[PDB]
Amino acid sequence: GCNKALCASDVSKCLIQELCQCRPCSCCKECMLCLGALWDECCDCVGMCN
Amino acid sequence: GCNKALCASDVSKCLIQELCQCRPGCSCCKECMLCLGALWDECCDCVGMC
Amino acid sequence: KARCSRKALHVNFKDMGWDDWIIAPLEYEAFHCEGLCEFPLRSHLEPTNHAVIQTLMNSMDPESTPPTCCVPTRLSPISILFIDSANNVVYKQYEDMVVESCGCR
Amino acid sequence: ARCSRKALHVNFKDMGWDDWIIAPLEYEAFHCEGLCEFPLRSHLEPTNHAVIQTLMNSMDPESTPPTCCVPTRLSPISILFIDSANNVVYKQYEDMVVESCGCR
Ligand SMILES: [Ca+2]
Ligand SMILES: [Ca+2]
Ligand SMILES: [Ca+2]
């Protein structure tokens, strides 16, 4: 699932940077770099879980 | 001054036709009155042309 | 309450009182946008950076900041045969008549 | 009361972005809020679709919902931040400040 309280700040950080906006894939890896440790807990927020 | 129930149909008719969209600061002030016709008196206030 | 999505909207011209100047078509599907615009805003639709930030603030304190709104982001035209104000018969293509995609703004 | 632009102060620390945004620490983004009922003022630049929906909403609000007050024009602002690769970047972000509102 997508924890809104835990992922809201950092997920939005990657969106305004024009990342995590592709669909599965090209940007699937630059997106994971931006989320960092929160990749496991926030992949579902952008559907990049593979 | 603008009867919404009486002017809704005819006013919208002239808007989608791209009429009554100029400002009196005038060009379309006359083409707008032609589209409203008899409802000009009862609907001029709806477009600020009086 | 589903999220922002495109929903049906049947437009009947006679019901609107436009049957006295629109010859054809007398009705068409225009669709409309309605739904919740809360985090996460789906990223594949490319929402504006402002909508992204506003949604974040709305998620931080919805009591203080309102959310973005579900509106049409891409509209297509339709052709209409009508009688203009000068009693001339015109076949024109009207722009921004049908909704093709929705998005939060 | 109707669709209009109102103030909206964006403070990055309040959002938890103080750990990667260096400057500015805050800026005014504004927001759009208000009613979208007939007559839609023509300066809002409403789409022909919005015009029709507003009319139908005025005839029978039970069956057709009204249009919504959203930004129609936006301007950018420059930001100095640290990307995910620890690089320092001074970039101009688009669609950051609201300049005009309109019903759509
Ligand atoms: Ca982890
Ligand atoms: Ca009529
Ligand atoms: Ca943080």
Numbering used by the authors:
A (entry chain D): 25 to 48, 53 to 78
B (entry chain C): 25 to 49, 53 to 77
C (entry chain A): 397 to 501
D (entry chain B): 398 to 501
What text appears in the publication on this structure?
Twisted gastrulation (TWSG1) is an evolutionarily conserved secreted glycoprotein which controls signaling by Bone Morphogenetic Proteins (BMPs). The TWSG1 N-terminal domain occupies the BMP type 1 receptor binding site on BMPs, whereas the C-terminal domain binds to a Chordin family member.
Serendipitously, the TWSG1–GDF5 complex crystallized in the presence of CaCl2, and we identified a calcium-binding site that mediated TWSG1–GDF5 interactions at the periphery of the binding interface. We confirmed the identity of the calcium ions by anomalous difference Fourier analysis. Since the calcium-binding residues in BMP ligands are conserved, and calcium is ubiquitously present in the extracellular space, our TWSG1–GDF5 structure brings this ion into focus.
